[PDB]
Amino acid sequence: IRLPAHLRLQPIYWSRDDVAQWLKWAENEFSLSPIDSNTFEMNGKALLLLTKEDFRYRSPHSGDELYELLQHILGSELQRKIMEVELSVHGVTHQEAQTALGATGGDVVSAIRNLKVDQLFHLSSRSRADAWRILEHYQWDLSAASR
């Protein structure tokens, strides 16, 4: 298998042009059915949010192949969990999410909450338990940071 040079194996950083390059490469390297590049008008972050059915909607004949190819390029789930954390807490970066997820043992829910209490703790002299209490009381809504 010959990879397309100048295309890193980090799909979370792929541009729209990189997605088109990956599609063209995949169609030729795996002899797939013709893929209209106009059917994947998105960047790499968006590609990670598609389900296998979403791939099939765009390419009934080779969409699931492309999905499995993406899964193997990603390898041994974390990149998608990181995106879910980044989509749940304002101001959290890739590294902040990865640190929180590793602390919570892959738990997205606990990582989001630990990150939410961190942000709330960053604004008051209250103890972390008081921050954990207000957030548990307010159903884990960080928007209720009223003072």
Applying CB under 5 A, does 73 fall inside the site for Cl ion? no
Of 21, 43, 79, 119, the residue at the interface with Cl ion (CB under 5 A) is: 79
Q: Which helix (H) or strand (E) holds 94?
A: helix 94-103
Select from 51-59, 75-83, 94-102, 123-131 the region that touches Cl ion (CB under 5 A): 75-83
Of 7, 12, 20, 145, the residue at the interface with Cl ion (CB under 5 A) is: 12
Of 11, 63, 85, 120, the residue at the interface with Cl ion (CB under 5 A) is: 11
Least Å distance between CB 60 and Cl ion? 26
Task: Give the C-alpha separation, 42 to 66, whole Å.
Answer: 15
Applying CB under 5 A, does 43 fall inside the site for Cl ion? no
Applying CB under 5 A, does 7 fall inside the site for Cl ion? no
Long-range CB pairs of 17-23 (<8 Å, 24+ gap) are 18/43, 18/44, 19/43, 19/44, 19/47, 23/66
Write the single-letter amino acid at 118: D
Q: What is the largest CA-CA distance in the chain?
A: 62
- The footprint of Cl ion (CB under 5 A) covers 10-12, 79
